Design a protein around this ligand. Structure first.
Ligand SMILES: O=S(=O)(O)CCCNC(CO)(CO)CO
Length: 301
């Protein structure tokens, strides 16, 4: 409703404020208004995320959208909020719902740049494997071409995918991760084969605690762009960095980010991203949570 739109935008401004980032109202309000029906507390998931290093001047936001509301990408294009890219990514969200059971969607953007991404969630008890995903016509060929590698490291079931319309990239969020997969030996071998930044002791300890792992792929080459390990927790001190600046800044955000569910501790999702040239950190502070997050905390925190 109107009040919800205002409440969520005010929260977004508060979160961005902690990072010294200013929101572009003209790029955000129309989007929130368009999806105002999803902003009611309960059943909704909203996350405001910060990052380290060269990615620190931006605040990302992600808002869940029920499938009943319809393809959110189709919505933003038809309403004139975003231009079709003319590339296969334009058809991926639709093709995913066509070929696989999608249980929920999500829209995502940057507070200074606006809408730029969608997510497709799959049922936890009926998740697709790399084979099913590689069959989708508009999926990057890189998914099928890295199938042998994924299998070798136990990256099988995918809980959700995300599509970045501006960068023309796809993330595969692997779940039901085996202990073996997250053991140091496995992680090091994987990063080695992908030619990504080698994590140290602190980084590997963080990887072992992960509940989700996601590589980023593209349509131009079969090479994986980067790999991210995610950790969910109520502990505000987990950023896997030795930098005093990061330690202080992430803890500050973790203990001051806005949240509507007072009476419970803030739900936090940390990320450790490994690219060919470096490693960086992310922290998503949930403004809205559901029982999915409560269950994850009991299982992983
Ligand atoms: O490989 S990179 O680090 O250049 C691209 C990833 C940056 N993405 C954010 C959003 O998902 C935004 O700045 C993450 O922090």
């Amino acid at each position: 409703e109107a009040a919800d739109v205002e409440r969520v935008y005010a929260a977004m401004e508060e979160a961005a404020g902690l990072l010294g980032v200013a929101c572009a109202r003209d790029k955000i309000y129309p989007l929130l208004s368009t999806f105002q029906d999803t902003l009611v507390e309960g059943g909704s998931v909203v996350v405001f995320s910060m990052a380290s290093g060269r990615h620190s001047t931006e605040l990302d936001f992600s808002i869940s959208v029920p499938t009943s509301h319809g393809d959110p990408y189709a919505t933003v294009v038809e309403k004139g909020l975003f231009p079709a890219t003319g590339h296969p990514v334009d058809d991926l969200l639709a093709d995913t719902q066509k070929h696989l059971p999608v249980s929920m969607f999500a829209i995502d953007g940057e507070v200074t740049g606006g809408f730029k991404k969608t997510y497709a969630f799959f049922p936890t008890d009926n998740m697709p494997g790399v084979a099913e995903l590689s069959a989708i016509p508009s999926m990057p060929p890189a998914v099928a071409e890295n199938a042998e590698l994924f299998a070798r490291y136990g990256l099988d079931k995918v809980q959700m995918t995300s599509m970045d319309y501006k960068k023309r990239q796809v993330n595969l969020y692997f779940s039901e991760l085996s202990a073996q997969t997250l053991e140091a030996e496995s992680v090091l071998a994987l990063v080695r084969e992908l030619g990504l930044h080698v994590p140290n002791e602190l980084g590997l300890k963080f990887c072992k605690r992960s509940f989700s792992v996601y590589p980023t792929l593209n349509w131009e080459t079969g090479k994986i762009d980067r790999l991210c390990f995610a950790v969910i927790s109520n502990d505000p001190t987990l950023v896997p960095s030795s930098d005093e600046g990061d330690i202080e800044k992430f803890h500050n955000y973790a203990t001051k980010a806005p949240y509507a569910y007072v009476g419970e501790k803030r739900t936090l999702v940390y990320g450790l991203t490994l690219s060919p040239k470096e490693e960086y950190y992310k922290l998503g502070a949930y403004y809205h949570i559901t029982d999915v997050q409560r269950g994850l905390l009991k299982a992983f925190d």
